[model samples]
Target: MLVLVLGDLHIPHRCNSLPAKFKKLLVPGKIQHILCTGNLCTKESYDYLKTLAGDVHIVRGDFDENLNYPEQKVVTVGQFKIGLIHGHQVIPDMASLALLQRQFDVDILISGHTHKFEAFEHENKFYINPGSATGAYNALETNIIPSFVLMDIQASTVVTYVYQLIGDDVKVERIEYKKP
Candidate 1:
């Protein structure tokens, strides 16, 4: 199954729409689930997402006005329990992440708000930060790279593909993680 993991898209506050390359790549039926790390900031984008996938999970971002959105959430993808957070506060903090992992007993945790893409394994758990989908400028930096991620999930392993846009070119990188 394929799960499209994305977030930190500030919509009109950053860019008007998803990149043409990305939009062309994403189509209905290609993705089984959509895991948004929040910062969508408006319901406008939420409707746009439904066309691609029916299962959309979003954590409430600090800037989001949607009260229905959760501050945090967990979803099961095959054998993995994935925790989603907005990361407007402290994230990438091993202690806090570890605490969350233990509390939720999740196998993977995904976070955003840095507008930076990162993926890693710590203590047998996987962590992913898919960066800003529209490459929005934030308090952290003015220049940024537009990126998102897709995970091909299997029973005991996942292949993570990071899609990044640079000057109209899309670059793809792959990472592998496994658990027993």
Candidate 2:
């Protein structure tokens, strides 16, 4: 299955809207699911994901206005059990994300909040952060470049498409993270 993962949009605060070029490249039909790590801050962003894919999973972010969304969500697609969460509530450090993986008994864990894109494997499980879709805020005012991720999961192999923004341009890089 192909899933598009993104979060920390921050919308009007960090960005007015997604880059037109990025939106054009991400055609909804190509992905089976849309996993968002939150901080969308508005109902509009949530509705937008629904239009993109049939399965839209979201975890509440620190700045989110909606109280209805849960802190963590578990989704099972094909042979994969995926856990989704926004990383703000994790105390001490970001590494705590792994605990969610074990608690959910999922093969993949998706999280965002640091606004830094990353994908890695630990103890046979996958963890991902699509980064800030709008490249909003961070400590010391870092890159703040817009980005997102596309994940292709088939059987035991996973391919991740990480997109990074430079100026007004966006570039795509592919990485493979596999279970050991």
Candidate 3:
């Protein structure tokens, strides 16, 4: 299963749209599922995601206008149970994220709000923050880098691919995680 994890696209408010380079890499038919961490703020962004994958799950962000989106969601892909949250409703810390991982009994917990890309393993569980797809600015920082994550899951292992736009370059990094 190929899952695309991303969030914090402020859209027309922060930027007009996703970078042309990122869009080129994310052409339709490549992704199987999408897990978004909110801040899309508009249906237009949701429509764009639909073109990428039919199975989509989203959690609400502070800036999101859509009240219908759930505050948290869990989806099972291959051998991992993935949890999704926007990270605005809870403290952005490792301990807090660990508790969420336990509460959901998930193999992976994904969140976004800081617009900074991060992925780490804690207490035998994986945590990911896909950052801002539009490189939107937050209160604390500017010059944010636009980024997202793609996970290729097979049985007990997952290969995570990180895509970041820095300067005029798009850098791709890979990480591997396995269920204990």
Candidate 4:
């Protein structure tokens, strides 16, 4: 199964739509599921995600007005159970993420809010932060990088593909992890 993980698109308020480079790669019928770490500040942003996949899981971000959205979520794909959050509700440290993993009993945890891309394995579980799709600026940082992640899950292994936009060019990187 293929899952697209992304978030922090402040649309119309922070920036316009997604970068043209990123938009070109994200077409319909390619990604099966979408996991958004929320900051989709508008309903149109949510509508755009719905066009990409039938199953889109979203967690509420600080700027989100949709009160119905959940603060956290758990999704099961193949042999892995995954957790999702927007990264503002918690302190966003590794210890806090570990506790979330335990709370959800998930094999992977995905979050956003820092507008920075991150992926790593801690305590035998995987974690990913897909960054800001629009690369919106915040109070602390101005050079926010645009990025997202894609996971290829099969049996007990997952291949993580990171897509990052830098200087008008898009770069792709890969990481592989297997269940122990």
Candidate 5:
């Protein structure tokens, strides 16, 4: 299955829209699921993601005024269970992360808020941060790199592809992990 994981858009407040280059690669029907880590700050951005996939999961960010979204959630895809969090109030992110993993008993955890892309494994489980898809500047820094993550999942392993747009260049990196 194809899972498009991303967030921290900040939409019109931070950046107008996703780079045209990113949109071109994200056609309507190709993505099977979307895991968004909030901060969209607009319904329009949600609608845009809806065009790409029907199974969209979103967590509320600190900036999100809507109270409808949950603080954390778990979704199952194929043989893997994924835990999603926005990381706004998560003080010790790793502690919260371990708690999320135990509570959900998930095979992978996906989070956002730092506006930087990262993927790593811990104790036989996987964790990922898709970063700011719009390259939105936050309190920590500016000149953010626009990026997102795509995970190709199989029964026993997942291959995550990171797409980052730096200046006029778009680069793709791959990372893979096997299930325990």
Candidate 6:
């Protein structure tokens, strides 16, 4: 199945708006599901994602105004179990987030909070961060570059698509991670 993973879309904060060109590229029919890591902030963003895909899953971020969303969520797709979280509530360090995967007994754990894109595996589980869709904030400066990710799951293999902006253009890169 084809799934789109995105998070940290601060919207108006970093980007005045979603890039029209980028939006056009993400055709709804191409993606079967959407996994959002929160910080969407407004109801409008959630609604937009709903329009993009039939199956939309989300977890609340620290700055999210919507109180109804859960801080963590688990979703089962085919033979794979997936865990989703915002990563802010994991105290001590980021490694704690990985523990959540064990708790959920999932094959993959997805999160975002640092606004940086990352993909890695540990102890037979896959961890993914789609980074900031709007690249809103960081400690140093506003390196607001739009980004998002796509995942392809077939049999036992999982492939990732990391899309990032360069100047006014967007580029797509692929990464593969094993579930063991």
Per-candidate TM equals: 0.94, 0.91, 0.97, 0.96, 0.94, 0.89
RMSD of each: 1.5, 1.7, 1.0, 1.1, 1.4, 2.0
Best by lDDT: 3
Which of 1 and 4 is ahead in TM-score?
A: 4
Model 1, 45-105: lDDT tens digits are 8887788899999999988868798888999999898999888766546787678767777
**Per-residue accuracy of model 6 over 2-21 as CA lDDT, tens digit each:** 99999888765555566676
After superposition, which runs of candidate 1 have C-alpha atoms over 4 Å from their true positions?
none
The superposed Cα distance between candidate 5 and the true structure at residue 65, in angstroms, equals: 3.1
Candidate 2 Cα deviation (angstroms), residue 166: 2.0
> On a 0 to 1 TM-score scale, where does candidate 5 land against the true structure?
0.94
Between candidates 1 and 4, the lDDT winner: 4
How many backbone overlaps does candidate 1 show? 0
Cα-based RMSD of candidate 1: 1.5
TM-score of 6: 0.89
Over 88-125, each residue of candidate 5 has an lDDT whose tens digit, in order, gives 76675677777777877899988898898889888888
Q: Rate the local accuracy (lDDT) of all candidates.
A: 0.88, 0.84, 0.91, 0.90, 0.89, 0.82
* lDDT of predicted model 1: 0.88
Better candidate by TM-score, 4 or 5 = 4
lDDT by residue (40-95, candidate 3, tens digit) is: 98899999999999988999999998889999999899989999999986675788
Worst 10 residues of 1 by lDDT: 89-98
Q: Which ten contiguous residues of candidate 6 have the minimum total lDDT?
A: 11-20
Per-residue alpha-carbon lDDT of candidate 2 for residues 1-180, written as tens digits (9 for 90 to 100): 888999999986667888777788777688898889999978888888888897888889989998898999998766778899998866744458777777888888888888889887787788888999878886675766788999888877789999888777778888886655
The TM-score between candidate 2 and the true structure equals 0.91
Which regions of candidate 2 are displaced past 4 Å? 139-141
RMSD (Cα, Å) of candidate 6?
2.0
lDDT score at residue 129, model 2, on the 0-100 scale: 88
**Cand. 4 Cα-lDDT:** 0.90
